């Protein structure tokens, strides 16, 4: 029995080993009580505003849309402390962890951004933080690993399977199975067992609430569509949530298409996978015919995850949100275009969302449309990845 509905239609649930159900129930109760506690809301708001730097800007693109009837705004989560939206809900989960008497944090990361966020929040709030990272990503993201360790987190490379996010998620869950009395598992996206998809949404939904107020102030009307990348789901549900009941506003989620859907080397389970049970939830996932979990691929480590949060699966099923995919090469062109024409270096994750908005503008350049792209993070962490790609293509 739960206080809140664990399912979004057929998707979601709490598919964890029995030993973890008390921890999930405790976390749900803590969250429900926190959402009614003005003292908790006041502390969370103070950290968001005065530590993380909310509200974030809403930037009108001046150059990218020249020659079209598209007006494009960028919601600047890249300007949050830590460099990505991840900081919003880590601060909320950390506060919940203290409300519950936990003194340790377990987290996993692939791009390193949620790891950086978990580490900074643990440093500020006095928690002992350990972070699992696919050993492959440990070598590609050694600067973010060092950041995490400078802020006092332990970083544990995972040599297993694809040596990427999924494999780090597994180890974090194994760890939590034997340390839940003292450690809070700080899940990094809007996925996993209930209550995490709900908690991450509610601790990210200021992104869409601010965007709505900002766009009404600047344009006097709601956007025609809001566009976000989808790895596990958090930044997109955060943008979407306040618009779900504004039925004129399109909701567009962008999955990574990798080298191309037809190559099988992608990260697009929502549109190209099959419903399964893993990660603690019932959700679309990339799997073999036999039901083994397949490895995903994306140029962007943060999108390289072979499942997707259940609320996105549900919003797709009913037609409220539309999901699309963007390939590595399209994401890379959009990264370069933003750098050169707006002076903003975007995360490669967010470059997928931008890339689809550029397509919407370029394919129909006489269509009048007001678009908002969630710029979920900055691309400082990606400049080495991008340099080695442009070096191998003779572009530089």
């Amino acid at each position: 029995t739960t206080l809140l509905n664990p399912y979004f239609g057929e998707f979601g649930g709490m598919y964890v080993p029995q030993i973890l159900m008390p921890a999930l129930n405790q976390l749900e109760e803590a969250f429900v009580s926190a959402q009614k506690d003005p003292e908790f809301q006041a502390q969370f708001a103070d950290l968001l505003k005065n530590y993380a730097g909310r509200p974030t800007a809403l930037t009108k693109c001046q150059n990218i849309t020249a020659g079209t009837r598209t007006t494009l705004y960028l919601k600047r989560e890249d300007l949050l402390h830590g460099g990505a939206h991840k900081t919003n809900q880590v601060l909320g989960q950390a506060l919940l962890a203290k409300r519950m008497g936990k003194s340790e944090i377990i987290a996993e990361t692939g791009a390193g951004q949620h790891g950086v966020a978990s580490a900074l929040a643990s440093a500020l709030l006095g928690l002992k933080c350990r972070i699992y990272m696919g050993a492959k990503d440990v070598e590609r993201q050694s600067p973010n690993v060092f950041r995490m360790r400078l802020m006092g987190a332990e970083v544990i490379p995972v040599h297993s399977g694809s040596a990427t996010l999924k494999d780090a998620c597994n180890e974090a869950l194994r760890d939590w199975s034997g340390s839940y009395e003292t450690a809070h598992y700080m899940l990094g996206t809007a996925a996993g067992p209930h209550p995490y998809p709900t908690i991450v949404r509610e601790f990210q939904r200021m992104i869409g609430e601010e965007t709505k107020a900002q766009i009404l102030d600047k344009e006097g009307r709601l956007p025609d569509a809001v566009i976000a990348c989808v790895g596990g789901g958090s930044n997109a549900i955060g943008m979407f949530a306040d618009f779900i009941n504004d039925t004129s506003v399109g909701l567009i989620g962008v999955e990574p298409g990798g080298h191309g859907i037809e190559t099988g080397e992608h990260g697009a389970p929502l549109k190209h996978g099959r419903v399964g049970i893993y990660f603690g939830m019932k959700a679309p996932m990339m799997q073999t015919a036999d039901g083994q979990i397949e490895e995903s691929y994306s140029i962007s480590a943060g999108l390289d995850f072979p499942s997707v949060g259940p609320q996105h699966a549900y919003l797709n099923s009913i037609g409220r949100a539309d999901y699309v995919s963007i390939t590595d090469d399209e994401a890379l062109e959009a990264f370069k275009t933003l750098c050169r024409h707006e002076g903003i270096i975007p995360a490669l994750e967010s470059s997928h969302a931008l890339a689809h908005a550029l397509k919407m503008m370029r394919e129909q350049p006489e269509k009048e449309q007001l678009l908002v792209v969630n710029l979920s993070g900055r691309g400082d962490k990606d400049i080495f990845t991008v340099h080695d790609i442009l070096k191998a293509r003779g572009e530089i």
């Binding site: 709490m14 080993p17 029995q18 399977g161 194994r174 036999d290």
Partner: protein
């Protein structure tokens, strides 16, 4: 029903059940079949059998590597069901339980999975990542195909969960020795007499204790506390991995270990 028959006999003989676990197809189909025949001949009262899964999130390194070995041999779930059918034809009375991950049960249809379990003669299914709160479609399909649904009693269980496990479970109750994942290196230390007695008060299926049981002394201790038996997996799998290049030394050492564990269950 094979579990009821087993526990009735063991009760008569003042004995507890020793129940080895192995991963089907580890290190190969043929050696795995030889291994299981040796466990039985050496004294196993029942079997717990795993189907290799790509992401076994309730297993520590020993059984993770057993899965990897089965995959290196090409072991598929379809081949595992072929093995299960042969094992049942060899051993008509032993209870055969499966330890499954949810996706392998769900992804070609829950009902079809349990229908295939009935076709090959499986007696029970435990789904490691389906808590009792999520179990309805799994329980119903098990029962519809004359399969016992197994539920876990964790050491942090409360009374409401004891009553659910007692009411919904059949065959045996899985009594968890401790938190964490499987592994012989980590021995459970919490006393479980209180949970064992509550389960009996509520008419639960007989309890087998599992996780971190790797010595005869732990087997006798679970029986001394009231449990109807003990399961050991990693300890047995470690013998497989240590003897991969000597298939018959492996069976010899498996035989010696099982007999010593089953002996400790006697009286």
């Amino acid at each position: 029903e094979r579990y009821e028959n087993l526990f009735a006999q063991l009760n008569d003989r003042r004995e507890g059940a020793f129940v080895p676990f192995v991963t089907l197809g580890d290190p190969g189909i043929e050696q795995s079949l030889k291994i299981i025949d040796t466990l039985i001949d050496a004294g196993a009262d029942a079997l717990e059998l795993g189907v290799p899964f790509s992401d076994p999130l309730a297993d520590g390194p020993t059984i993770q590597n057993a899965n990897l070995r089965a995959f290196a041999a090409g072991v598929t779930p379809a081949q595992c069901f072929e093995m299960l059918a042969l094992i049942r034809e060899k051993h008509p009375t032993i209870p055969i339980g499966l330890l499954m991950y949810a996706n392998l049960v769900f992804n070609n249809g829950i009902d079809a999975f349990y229908a295939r379990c009935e076709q090959v003669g499986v007696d029970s299914v435990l789904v490691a990542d389906v808590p009792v709160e999520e179990s309805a479609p799994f329980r119903q399909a098990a029962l519809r195909h004359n399969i016992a649904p197994i539920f876990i009693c964790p050491p942090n269980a409360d009374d409401d969960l004891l009553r659910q496990v007692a009411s919904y479970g059949r065959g045996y109750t899985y009594l968890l020795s401790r938190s964490g994942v499987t592994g012989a290196e980590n021995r459970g230390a919490l006393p479980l007499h209180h949970l064992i007695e509550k389960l009996k008060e509520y008419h639960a299926a007989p309890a087998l204790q599992g996780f971190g049981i790797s010595s005869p002394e732990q087997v006798s201790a679970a029986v001394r506390a009231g449990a109807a038996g003990a399961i050991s997996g990693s300890a047995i799998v470690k013998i497989i991995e240590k003897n991969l290049a000597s298939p018959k030394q492996m069976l010899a050492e498996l035989r010696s270990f099982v007999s010593a564990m089953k002996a400790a269950s006697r009286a």
